[PDB]
């Protein structure tokens, strides 16, 4: 269960890394997609859709817009599993 979450986070990391051409080592729960990870508007849109695909979920733009850091998107994926 705790190990589930860790492995899940490791998978979320890989997507964000790959998408934003960034080292996993930079993809901390704190890291902000724009400010720290160097993502523009198109990057964020493609990232959301990439995460949506990978973990087979959906995120409405009303709550997709609230997210700023990777931790936000992590916590989001954990709720909608």
């Amino acid at each position: 269960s705790m190990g589930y979450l860790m492995a899940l986070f490791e998978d979320i990391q890989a997507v964000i890394a790959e998408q934003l051409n960034v080292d996993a080592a930079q993809v901390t729960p704190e890291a902000e997609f724009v400010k720290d990870l160097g993502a523009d508007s198109l990057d964020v849109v493609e990232l959301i859709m990439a995460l949506e695909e990978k973990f087979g979920i959906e995120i409405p733009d009303e709550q997709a817009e609230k997210i700023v850091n990777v931790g936000d998107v992590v916590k989001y994926i954990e709720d909608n599993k």
Binding site: L42, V45, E46, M49, E52, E58, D61
Partner: protein, 151 residues
């Protein structure tokens, strides 16, 4: 409606000469797919430059045609044939992928656009498919676009 002519296309797409590259829509299934086409004739300004003595329709304009078809599908899927609400958005081309050119397209060809919806969420549309001449594939592409308030 399932068949749209140039008069209909003009009311929906903001593109005008020389960048309107869809002549007719022959098949439309909301949120699913579209079949449209552009006639290719020697009497187009492009062929002056591409190329002198050998007219070949630019592969990037095939992709543009497909994108325009995809755009028409996205709009009428979300708002139907609404020329008035058409005049409150233009459509932005986000990405292009997996483009392959197979056969040259020339004056005399009817260039058909076959696009499936690959994914759509709200306002972002991802479509892919082919361009065909006489039931043979001449080109392939995937692309992503989103809708934006116009001018």
């Amino acid at each position: 409606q399932s068949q749209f002519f140039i008069e209909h296309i003009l009311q929906i797409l903001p593109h005008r000469y020389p960048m309107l590259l869809v002549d007719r829509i022959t098949e439309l299934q909301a949120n699913q797919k579209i079949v449209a086409y552009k006639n290719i004739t020697f009497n187009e300004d492009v062929f002056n430059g591409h190329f002198p003595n050998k007219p070949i329709f630019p592969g990037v304009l095939i992709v543009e045609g497909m994108a325009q078809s995809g755009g028409f599908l996205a709009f009428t899927s979300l708002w139907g044939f609404d020329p008035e609400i058409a005049k409150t958005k233009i459509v932005y081309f986000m990405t292009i992928d997996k483009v392959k050119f197979r056969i040259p397209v020339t004056p005399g060809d009817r260039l058909e656009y076959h696009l499936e919806v690959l994914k759509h969420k709200g306002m972002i549309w991802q479509v892919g498919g082919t361009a065909q001449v006489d039931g043979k594939v001449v080109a392939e592409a995937e692309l992503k676009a989103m809708i934006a308030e116009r001018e």
